[PDB]
Design a binder for this molecule. Structure first.
Ligand code: RYF
Ligand code: NI
Length: 316
């Protein structure tokens, strides 16, 4: 019965946050391979789940409009102050992206050109667990197919929140749920393939070897290099996936994920080749070197600059 809200339909239930498009463009962020939990259900209206609640997000030129669906058959109302703070933290709007863009552009002419069109590409502050297992599913995959895997994984293992039109929303499952004896077999049935093993195995590892999700919070306050190494002990988690989690979940802005995409960008757009390393093609050593290159160039928010180029590279 209940359906997706729009700003025209039910404007009484919405609430705004002052946000220029220099700071945030929804359409360049919510589907740029950071989160896989957002979909443009109706034009310019992005629906998705955040911390066991569903949101719908739209924006004008200088406002970010948002509405919440609590789901527990309570009185529908506007977002509260605390829910708005949660969304503020999610987009990290405390950090000025306008000043970052100008800073990166001063030492990078290529970024300057791309920054013209692609403004408001910022990093989401994601839940560690959600980020971890999502990016375990990302190996040899694509954003469309990953989005399917994660959706199905949440329906099978996660708690139901609400239904809107013909879309049922589920919260992300806890580690215990993914660590069960039947979890791998079920995940293979859902089409994850070899990734099903890593999902189950990393669930068990975090519980048994690292002591639950408190560990991921410890890595959030630990240094980048400490957190990175710790993640790489998990099944299915290497340097690429570890860096993604660092950048997107563990508040390491200097983390620069190096996969085939950024290796292409580095070579084509910056003319970079591995100098310190001997081998011409990709390698663990050469990928690490390229990460160091971008940190040296861009500085302590190098991962944020990387996301601007990554997002721009998706759009042909
Ligand atoms: I397949 C697949 C899916 C998603 C990604 N996401 C990213 N990887 C590296 N840097 C990034 N910055 N923003 C997203 C992002 C990569 C490969
Ligand atoms: Ni070359």
């Amino acid at each position: 019965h209940m359906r997706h809200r729009t700003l025209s339909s039910s404007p009484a239930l919405w609430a705004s946050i002052p946000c220029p498009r220099s700071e945030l463009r929804l359409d360049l962020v919510l589907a740029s391979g950071q989160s896989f939990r957002w979909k443009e259900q109706s034009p310019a209206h992005w629906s998705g789940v955040l911390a066991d609640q569903v949101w719908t997000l739209t924006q004008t030129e200088d406002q970010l409009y948002c509405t919440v669906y609590r789901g527990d058959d309570s009185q529908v109302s506007r977002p509260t102050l605390e829910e708005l703070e949660t969304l503020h933290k999610y987009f990290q709007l405390d950090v000025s992206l306008a000043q970052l863009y100008s800073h990166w552009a001063s030492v990078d002419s290529h970024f300057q050109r791309v920054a013209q069109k692609f403004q408001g590409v910022r990093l989401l502050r994601q839940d560690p667990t959600e980020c971890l297992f999502s990016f375990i599913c990302s190996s040899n995959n694509n954003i469309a197919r990953i989005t399917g895997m994660v959706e199905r994984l949440c329906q099978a293992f996660g708690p139901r929140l609400i239904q809107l039109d013909d879309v049922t929303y589920h919260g992300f499952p806890n580690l215990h749920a993914l660590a069960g004896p039947e979890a791998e077999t079920h995940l293979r049935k859902l089409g994850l393939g070899y990734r099903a093993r890593y999902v189950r195995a990393s669930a068990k590892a975090i519980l048994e070897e690292q002591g639950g999700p408190a560990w991921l919070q410890q890595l959030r306050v630990a240094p980048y290099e400490e957190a990175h190494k710790a993640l790489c002990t998990l099944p299915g988690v290497g340097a690429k996936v570890a860096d993604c989690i660092c950048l997107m979940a563990l508040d390491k802005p200097q983390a620069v994920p190096v996969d085939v995409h950024v290796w292409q960008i580095a070579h084509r757009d910056y003319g970079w080749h591995p100098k310190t390393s001997q081998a011409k093609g990709p390698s663990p050593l050469a990928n690490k070197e390229l990460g160091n290159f971008f940190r040296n160039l861009w500085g302590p928010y190098a991962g944020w600059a990387q996301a601007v180029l990554f997002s721009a590279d998706l759009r042909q």
